[PDB]
C-alpha cells in the first residue's frame, strides 16, 4: 500500500553526445564519368542526287580520316543528259538569254550540283561522269558503296562526322540536379592524355535524363587542333563546390522511418523532445534541413537510442515524453 511516485519517461544521463544545429553550406567533391565523342554539328551524309552506276571508288573505308574535298567515288549519272543536251543545242542556235537561264536552272532543281553545271557551260560537252568529294573534315563512320555496284539515291556513300571541336558528355546523378543547374566550373580530365586536363567553364545541361541509369547529360566541347582526344575515349568530369547556406545537423542525428523523418532535440533543461523535421539533402556526413529546427538548437546524434531490430520508431519516441 505504498504511494511513492516516479517519473516514467525514458531517461538518459550516462552517455549522450549532442551536436548543435549550425547554419552552413553542403559541400561536394564528385567526379562524374564522361565520354569523348564526335561533334554532331559537324555531320555530313553524302548521297547521290540521282541514280546511276559506280565507275570507281577511291581508297577509303569506314574508320579512315578525310579532309574536305577528298574524292570518294566516281559515278555515271544519266538522269541529266537529256536536259543538258537541251541547253547545249539551245546555244548552237543562240536561244534567248532567258531561254538559257531557264534550262540552266531547271538543271539545278534537277539535282545536278552547281559545280558540275559550270563544267557544262565551260566545256560545252555533256556531263555524265561525276565525282563526289568529302564535304567536311572528319572521320568516315559509314561507307556503303564499293566497286561494281549500282548507286541508288538513298544509299549513303559516306557518313563523315568530325572531331574539330570534339564533344564530351558527363553523366551526373539526377540527385544533384538542384546543385548542378547553378554550377560554375568543372575540371575535365581524360586518362588517355594526362596533360590535356583543362577547366571547363561553359557547358550545356540537356533537358532529358537517361533512364537506364538515372543521370543528367552535361555536354561540353573541347578544342582538338592536335586531334588528341579521340571519340570513344573515357573521360572524367569533376565538380568541387558548395551549396547555398542551409540548416545543418549531423546525419547521425536524424531518425528517419520510411515515411516520417525527425530528430531528438535536447531542450533548455535536459529533457529529450522528438520534433518532426523537413529534410532537403545530405552530403559528406551532414544533412541540410528544409525546416523544423531553429539555428542553434541542441540535437543528439543517435538513432542508437532505439534498438534497431525492434521497437516501433513511433512508439519508442513516444516513451521519451509526457
Amino acid at each position: 500500500a505504498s504511494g511513492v511516485r516516479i517519473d516514467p519517461t525514458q531517461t538518459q544521463n550516462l552517455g549522450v553526445k549532442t551536436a548543435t544545429v549550425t547554419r552552413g553550406p553542403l559541400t561536394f567533391a564528385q567526379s562524374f564519368p564522361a565520354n569523348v565523342s564526335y561533334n554532331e554539328y559537324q555531320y555530313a551524309i553524302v548521297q547521290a542526287r540521282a541514280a546511276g552506276f559506280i565507275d570507281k571508288v577511291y581508297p577509303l573505308t569506314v574508320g579512315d580520316k578525310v579532309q574536305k574535298g577528298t574524292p570518294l567515288l566516281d559515278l555515271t549519272i544519266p538522269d541529266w543528259v537529256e536536259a543538258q543536251s537541251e541547253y547545249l543545242l539551245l546555244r548552237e542556235t543562240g536561244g534567248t538569254a532567258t531561254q538559257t537561264e531557264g534550262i540552266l536552272e531547271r538543271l539545278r532543281l534537277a539535282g545536278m550540283p552547281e559545280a558540275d553545271i559550270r563544267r557544262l557551260i565551260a566545256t560545252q560537252k555533256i556531263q555524265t561522269r561525276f565525282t563526289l568529294k568529302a564535304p567536311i573534315d572528319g572521320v568516315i563512320t559509314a561507307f556503303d558503296l564499293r566497286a561494281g555496284m549500282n548507286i541508288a539515291k538513298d544509299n549513303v556513300v559516306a557518313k563523315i562526322q568530325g572531331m574539330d571541336p570534339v564533344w564530351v558528355t558527363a553523366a551526373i546523378p539526377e540527385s544533384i540536379a538542384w546543385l548542378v543547374k547553378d554550377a560554375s566550373q568543372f575540371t575535365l580530365t581524360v586518362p588517355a592524355r594526362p596533360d590535356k586536363t583543362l577547366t571547363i567553364r561553359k557547358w550545356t545541361l540537356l533537358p532529358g535524363v537517361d533512364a537506364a541509369t538515372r543521370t543528367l547529360q552535361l555536354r561540353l566541347e573541347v578544342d582538338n587542333a592536335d586531334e588528341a582526344l579521340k571519340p570513344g575515349m573515357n573521360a572524367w568530369l569533376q565538380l568541387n563546390t558548395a551549396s547555398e547556406p542551409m540548416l545543418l545537423i549531423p546525419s547521425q542525428a536524424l531518425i528517419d522511418t520510411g515515411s516520417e523523418q525527425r530528430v531528438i532535440t535536447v531542450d533548455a533543461d535536459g529533457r529529450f523532445v522528438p520534433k518532426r523535421v523537413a529534410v532537403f539533402q545530405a552530403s559528406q556526413g551532414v544533412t541540410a534541413l528544409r525546416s523544423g529546427l531553429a539555428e542553434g538548437e541542441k540535437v543528439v546524434s543517435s538513432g542508437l537510442f532505439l534498438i534497431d531490430s525492434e521497437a516501433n520508431i513511433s512508439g519508442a519516441l513516444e516513451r521519451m515524453r509526457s
Binding site: 516516479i6 531517461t11 544521463n13 550516462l14 552517455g15 542508437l304
Partner: protein, 1027 residues
C-alpha cells in the same frame, strides 16, 4: 604408552609442533576464501546462436541432430535443451563424481562432427571453463561529459577492457552486458530497386563481392622480395555507396548509393543494462574459472584497473556494480573475530577454575599449536574454501582445549596427595617428573579414546552427497583435524609444558542435591527420562529450511512477467523498476539487466530481469532497519502491473539454477510430453500458491505464449513470377528481417553490415502484406501477391529437462518458514488441482536439496551407533556401554528446546550440530565412567566386591563427584562460552553459524545438568545386578 615415548623426547617433538605450527600458519596463507564451492559441475553448456528465428525447427533441429549426437556421446545421461528466439541452449549432464574436463573432452567428440550440419553463420559454441556461480565482479561504463555514447562505450568494452581482463590468470571469461553494437545499416528503398531495375538479391551479391583483400604473392626486385597486396576492405561510408550494382556499355554505373542509404545504427540487442534508474549503460562481468580463487582474482583485477586510469578516454568512468570481496572479507573477518573471542574465553575459564599463571598458560599453549595444526590439515583440503573450514575450527575450539585442562586437573589434586603424605620442604626434579607421569597414567588412556569416538561420530558426514556435503564437509574435516591433532600434541607435548612450568561455593551448591539422587537410584532415572517426552511435543513449533539464509550486502531482484514482452518495452520496464528501487534510502547502487550478456552462462530472456542491488553499509541505514525489513519495503515500493518480482541473493541464484534450475527458494516443476497439458498444470498450481498465507508473490513462467506473424508462401502463386520458395524468403530474411550480411574489418574490431527496407514498409501485418517485391522478370508485385500472412500464437520458448518438456513454477516465501510453506503447497495441489493425464508434478529449489540431505540420516545415526558401540567397548564392559547412548538423547533434548527460544529451524547446519552433540557424549562418558570405575577400583573397592555396605560406595561416588566437578565444570565453562558466539546472529554468516551451534548449545547445558546424576545413579543399579 605413546605418552611415555613423548616424555622421552621432551624437547624435540614440541619444537616440531611449533614448526608444524608456522608451517600451519602458511598452509593457510593460500587463503582468501570461497563463500561457495557449492556448485554442481556435471554439466557442459553448448550454445548455438541465431540459426534462424523459428522456435519450432531452429531449436527443434539444434535440439534434434545436435542432441541426438549428445545421446551418442559417452558419459551420456540426459540432453536438455533451452530453445528460444534464434538461440539454442543445451546442457549435457553426468554422474556426480565425474571430473570436470573429462566431461568436456567427451562432449567435444560430437560438437565437431555436428558443426558441419549447422547453417552458414552459426557456430555451436562450447561453454566457458567456469559456471554461473563464477560471476565475480560486475561494472558499468558511464560518461556524463557527453563526449562518448553507448555505441562508443560498448566498443570500449569489447575491444579494450574485455581483452585487458581476460588475460589475468584464473579468469575464464570477461562477458559484455547491455550496451550498443555499432552496425552498418544499408537501408534499401524498394522504389529505387524498381526504378533502377535492380533486385534485392543483386544488391546482396554486389555488396558481398566488394569487401575483402587479396594476396598477389611476391616479386623479387633488387634481390629483395616485394609482397604484392590488394586493397578492398570496406571502411568508409563512401566505399559502401560506391559498391557497383551494374554498369552500361557507356561505362556509366549504378551504385549502392543510388538504391539505398548507408546509415550507422544500433545492432539488435540481446539484453539491456541500466544503472541507478538514470541511464542505459554498457557493462562487463568477470567470470571466474571453475576451480580457481575468487578474491585472488578480484584483487588482481582492481589493480589492473588503476593501470587503466591514464588509459581511459576523458569522461569515461567505471562505476562498479558488484564485488565478491566485500562479502568474502566480511565473512572471513567475523569468523576470525570469533576464533579470537573463543580463545580469550577459555583463557578466562582455564584461569577461573585454576589460579596459577603457569596453570592457565599451559592450557593456553594448547591452543596456538592446536590452531596451527588445524591450519596444517587446512592445506590437505585448503582453507581457500568456505567459512565452514573456519567455522569448524570455531565450533570445536571448546573441546580442543578440554583435552589439556582435564589432564592438568588430574595433576593438580594428584599433587595434593604427595604433599600431604610426604613433607613440604623438600622437592626435587624427580618428584615432579613422577607426579606428571601419575597424572598422565590415570586420566591418560580415557581422554584419547574419547577424541577418537568424536571423530567417528562425525565420519558419517563425509557421506553427505552434494552441496550440503560440501557445506559441512570442510567443517567435517577441519574438526576431525585440530582435535585429532590436539590429542596428539596433548599426548606428546601438553604434559611437558605443565611439568617444565571459590571452588567451595560450587561443591556446596552441588552435592546437597546429589545425595538426593540416591534416595532411590532407579526412580531418579525415570523422572529424567520423561524429560525426553517433553521434547517430542514442542517438536511442533519450529520448522526447517535446507540452509540458513546467508545474507550478503548485495541483493538480487528478479521480477518475471508473461512470456511475450518486447525488447523496447522490457528495457523500459527495467528503467522504471530501477528508479523505484533507488528511491529506497538503504540502496546505494542499482544495476538492472533484461535479456542476457555476451556469455554462454546467461540464458535469461527479455521478459525476465536480473537487477543487482547494493545497499549502503549498515552503518548508514535508518533507525529500526533490518535486511528482512528492507526487502519488505522493496517489495512494496517496487511493483508494476502483470509483473511478479522475486527477491533472491546474488549467489544463491546462479547456484540454485546450477543444481535444479529454479531461480527461487520454492520450486514446482511440471514436466509433460504434451504442451497444452503442462501450461494447464502450470496455471492451476500458480493459483493455489497465492491463497496460501505464506507467500509474497507467485507466477509460473509460460511456454506457449509466443506471438507470431506468419508468412505462408504459396508455391503455385510465386511460380507465376518465376520465384522459388527461397526467392520470396529473401524478402523475409533480408528485406523485412534485417539479417546480417557481413562484417567490416576495422583493425582489432569487427562490426556487422546488413540490408533492410525502411521500417515503414515492415510496420504491421498490413505493411508486410503490401511489401513491394521486384520479381525476377522485373514485375512489380507485393508480398501478399505470393503469400497469405496471418497473426498467430505458438511456442514462446520450448523448454526441456532430460529431453522432456517442462515449465518451472516460481514461488516466493520469506515472512514464513520454508518447510511450513512447501508442505502446504503440495497439499493444496493434490487436493484442489486434480491429476491431469500424463503430467508429473514435483518440487525443487531448496526443498529438493533438503530431501537429499534428510535421506541417509537414518544411516547417519546407526553408522554412528555401529561405530560408537565399537568404541564404548576403554572399558570392555557391554552392560556399561548401553548407558552411554541413553545418556546422549537427553543432550539432544537440550539442543531442540534452544532452537525454540532462538527461533531457529531444522537445517543440515543444525543436523551437523546434533551429530557433533553426540560427539561430545563419548567424552562425557569417559570423564565419569573412569571416575566411577576408579572409586570402585581404589582402596575402598576392596570393600564392595567383597561384601555389602551401601554407605561405602556412597562415599566413593560422592568422592567421584567432587573429583569430576573441578575438571568437568571447567570443561563445560569453555563450551557454554564458545556456545554463545556461534549463537549470535550479527555479522556476515553469523546466522548460519548460529543454526549449526544452538543444537550443541542447549545440547551441552543439558548433559552436565543431567548426566551428572543419571550416569552415576544408573551404575548404582547395575552393580546391584552382578551381586
Amino acid at each position: 604408552w605413546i605418552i611415555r615415548r613423548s616424555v622421552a623426547n621432551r624437547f624435540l617433538v614440541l619444537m616440531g609442533a611449533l614448526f608444524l605450527s608456522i608451517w600451519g600458519t602458511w598452509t593457510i596463507i593460500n587463503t582468501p576464501v570461497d563463500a561457495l564451492p557449492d556448485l554442481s559441475d556435471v554439466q557442459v553448456i553448448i550454445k548455438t546462436s541465431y540459426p534462424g528465428q523459428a522456435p519450432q525447427i531452429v531449436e527443434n533441429q539444434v535440439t534434434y541432430p545436435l542432441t541426438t549426437t549428445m545421446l551418442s556421446v559417452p558419459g551420456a545421461k540426459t540432453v536438455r535443451g533451452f530453445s528460444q528466439f534464434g538461440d539454442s541452449y543445451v546442457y549435457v549432464i553426468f554422474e556426480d563424481g565425474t571430473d570436470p574436463y573429462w566431461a568436456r573432452s567427451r562432449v567435444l567428440e560430437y560438437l565437431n562432427q555436428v558443426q558441419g550440419k549447422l547453417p552458414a553463420g552459426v557456430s555451436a559454441e562450447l561453454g566457458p571453463d567456469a559456471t554461473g556461480v563464477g560471476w565475480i565482479y560486475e561494472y558499468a561504463l558511464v560518461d556524463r561529459s557527453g563526449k562518448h555514447d553507448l555505441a562508443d562505450l560498448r566498443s570500449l568494452q569489447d575491444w579494450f577492457l574485455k581483452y585487458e581482463l581476460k588475460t589475468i590468470p584464473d579468469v575464464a571469461e570477461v562477458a559484455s552486458v547491455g550496451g550498443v553494437v555499432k552496425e552498418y545499416q544499408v537501408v534499401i528503398d524498394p522504389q529505387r530497386l524498381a526504378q533502377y531495375g535492380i533486385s534485392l538479391a543483386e544488391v546482396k551479391s554486389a555488396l558481398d563481392a566488394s569487401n575483402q583483400e587479396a594476396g598477389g604473392s611476391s616479386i623479387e626486385l633488387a634481390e629483395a622480395e616485394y609482397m604484392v597486396r590488394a586493397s578492398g576492405y570496406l571502411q568508409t561510408l563512401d566505399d559502401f555507396n560506391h559498391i557497383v550494382l551494374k554498369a552500361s556499355e557507356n561505362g556509366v554505373p549504378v551504385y549502392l548509393r543510388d538504391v539505398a542509404k548507408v546509415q550507422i545504427g544500433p545492432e539488435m540487442r540481446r539484453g539491456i543494462a541500466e544503472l541507478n534508474g538514470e541511464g542505459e549503460v554498457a557493462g562487463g562481468v568477470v567470470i571466474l574459472r571453475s576451480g580457481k580463487n575468487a578474491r585472488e582474482v578480484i584483487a588482481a583485477v582492481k589493480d589492473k584497473l588503476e593501470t587503466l586510469k591514464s588509459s581511459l578516454p576523458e569522461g569515461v568512468e567505471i562505476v562498479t556494480t558488484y564485488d565478491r570481496s566485500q562479502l568474502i572479507d566480511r565473512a572471513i573477518d567475523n569468523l576470525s573475530g570469533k576464533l579470537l573471542e573463543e580463545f580469550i574465553v577459555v583463557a578466562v575459564v582455564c584461569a577461573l577454575f585454576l589460579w596459577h599463571v603457569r596453570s592457565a598458560l599451559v592450557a593456553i599453549i594448547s591452543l596456538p599449536l592446536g590452531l596451527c595444526i588445524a591450519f596444517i590439515v587446512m592445506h590437505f583440503q585448503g582453507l581457500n574454501a568456505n567459512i565452514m573450514s573456519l567455522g569448524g575450527i570455531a565450533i570445536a575450539v571448546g573441546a580442543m582445549v578440554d583435552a589439556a585442562i582435564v589432564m592438568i586437573e588430574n595433576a593438580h589434586k594428584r599433587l595434593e596427595e604427595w604433599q600431604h603424605q610426604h613433607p613440604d620442604a623438600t622437592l626435587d626434579n624427580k618428584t615432579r617428573w613422577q607426579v606428571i607421569t601419575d597424572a598422565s597414567v590415570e586420566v591418560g588412556p580415557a581422554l584419547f579414546i574419547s577424541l577418537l569416538i568424536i571423530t567417528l561420530s562425525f565420519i558419517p558426514i563425509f557421506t553427505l552427497e552434494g552441496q550440503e556435503g560440501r557445506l559441512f564437509g570442510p567443517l567435517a574435516f577441519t574438526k576431525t583435524y585440530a582435535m585429532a591433532g590436539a590429542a596428539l600434541l596433548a599426548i606428546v607435548v601438553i604434559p611437558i609444558l605443565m611439568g617444565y612450568w571459590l571452588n567451595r561455593f560450587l561443591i556446596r551448591v552441588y552435592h546437597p542435591l546429589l545425595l538426593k539422587v540416591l534416595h532411590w537410584p532407579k526412580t531418579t532415572l525415570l523422572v529424567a527420562a520423561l524429560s525426553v517426552l517433553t521434547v517430542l511435543w514442542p517438536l511442533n513449533k519450529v520448522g526447517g529450511e535446507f540452509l540458513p539464509q546467508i545474507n550478503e550486502g548485495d541483493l538480487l531482484y528478479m521480477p518475471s512477467t508473461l512470456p511475450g514482452i518486447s525488447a523496447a518495452e522490457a528495457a523500459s520496464m527495467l528503467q522504471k523498476t530501477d528508479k523505484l528501487i533507488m528511491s529506497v534510502p538503504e540502496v546505494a547502487r542499482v544495476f538492472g539487466k533484461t535479456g542476457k550478456a555476451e556469455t554462454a552462462t546467461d540464458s535469461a530472456p527479455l521478459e525476465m530481469v536480473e537487477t543487482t542491488i547494493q545497499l549502503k553499509p549498515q552503518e548508514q541505514w535508518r533507525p529500526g532497519m533490518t535486511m528482512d525489513k528492507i526487502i519488505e519495503e522493496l517489495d512494496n515500493t517496487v511493483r508494476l502491473p502483470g509483473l511478479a518480482n522475486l527477491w533472491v541473493p546474488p549467489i544463491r541464484n546462479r547456484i540454485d539454477m546450477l543444481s535444479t534450475g529454479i531461480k527461487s527458494p520454492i520450486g514446482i516443476k511440471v514436466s509433460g510430453t504434451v504442451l497444452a497439458d503442462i501450461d494447464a498444470m502450470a496455471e492451476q498450481i500458480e493459483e493455489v500458491a497465492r491463497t496460501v498465507p505464506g507467500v509474497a508473490s507467485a507466477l509460473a513462467e509460460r511456454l506457449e505464449g509466443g506471438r507470431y506473424i506468419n508468412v505462408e508462401i504459396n508455391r503455385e502463386k510465386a511460380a507465376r513470377y518465376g520465384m522459388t520458395v527461397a526467392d520470396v524468403q529473401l524478402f523475409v530474411t533480408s528485406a523485412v528481417g534485417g539479417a546480417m550480411v557481413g562484417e567490416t574489418v576495422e583493425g582489432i574490431a569487427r562490426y556487422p553490415i546488413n540490408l533492410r527496407y525502411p521500417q515503414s514498409w515492415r510496420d504491421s501485418p498490413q505493411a508486410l502484406r503490401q511489401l513491394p517485391i521486384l520479381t525476377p522478370m522485373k514485375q512489380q508485385i507485393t508480398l501478399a501477391d505470393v503469400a497469405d500472412i496471418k497473426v498467430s500464437t505458438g511456442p514462446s520458448m520450448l523448454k526441456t529437462e532430460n529431453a522432456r518438456p517442462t515449465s518451472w513454477i516460481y514461488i516466493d516465501a520469506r515472512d514464513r518458514d520454508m518447510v511450513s510453506v512447501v508442505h502446504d503447497l503440495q497439499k493444496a495441489i493434490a487436493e484442489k488441482v486434480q491429476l491431469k493425464p500424463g503430467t508429473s508434478v514435483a518440487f525443487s529449489g531448496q526443498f529438493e536439496l533438503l530431501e537429499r540431505a534428510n535421506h541417509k540420516l537414518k544411516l547417519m545415526v546407526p553408522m554412528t551407533l555401529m561405530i560408537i558401540f565399537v568404541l564404548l567397548y576403554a572399558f570392555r564392559r557391554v552392560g556399561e556401554a548401553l548407558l552411554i547412548i541413553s545418556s546422549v538423547p537427553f543432550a539432544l533434548v537440550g539442543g531442540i528446546w534452544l532452537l525454540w527460544w532462538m527461533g531457529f529451524h531444522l537445517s543440515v547446519a543444525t543436523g551437523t550440530g546434533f551429530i557433533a552433540l553426540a560427539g561430545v557424549a563419548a567424552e562425557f562418558g569417559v570423564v565419569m565412567l573412569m571416575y566411577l570405575r576408579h572409586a570402585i577400583e581404589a582402596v575402598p573397592s576392596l570393600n564392595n566386591p567383597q561384601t555389602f555396605s551401601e554407605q561405602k560406595l556412597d562415599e566413593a561416588l560422592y568422592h567421584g563427584a567432587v573429583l569430576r566437578v573441578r575438571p568437568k565444570a571447567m570443561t563445560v565453562a569453555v563450551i557454554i562460552a564458545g556456545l554463545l558466539p556461534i549463537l549470535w546472529g550479527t555479522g556476515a554468516g553469523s546466522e548460519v553459524m548460529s543454526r549449526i551451534a544452538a543444537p550443541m548449545i542447549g545440547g551441552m547445558i543439558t548433559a552436565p545438568l543431567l548426566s551428572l546424576f543419571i550416569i552415576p545413579a544408573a551404575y548404582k543399579l547395575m552393580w546391584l545386578h552382578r551381586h
